[PDB]
Amino acid sequence: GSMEIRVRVEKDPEIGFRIAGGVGGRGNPFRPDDDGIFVTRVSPEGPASKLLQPGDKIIQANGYSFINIELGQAISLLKTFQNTVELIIVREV
């Protein structure tokens, strides 16, 4: 019973999170059967602090799918966006 939520983060100057998972990754601490990308840490006073939470699964960023991608590709993409990052996340209600 999850839902897809759209969250806008304004880099200031970063997003303010750490992520894990991906194809060929070593899993994640939330859903071990899922090779997707998960938020593992959010800076407490950072740009994502009232918007994202550990456990969120990132499935899209500025229109780019995060399904079936490797962690390195997700990291490079998120770092390359300069300002607005519009995420679709899957979150437990």
Partner 1 sequence: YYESDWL
Choose which of 4, 18, 67, 84 interacts with partner 1 (CB under 8 A).
Answer: 18
| 53 vs 93 by CB, closer to partner 1 | 53
Burial of 14 (0-12, 13-18, 19+ CB in 10 A): middle
Verify binding: residue 20, partner 1, rule CB under 8 A: yes
| 17 vs 66 by CB, closer to partner 1 | 17
| 15 vs 51 by CB, closer to partner 1 | 15
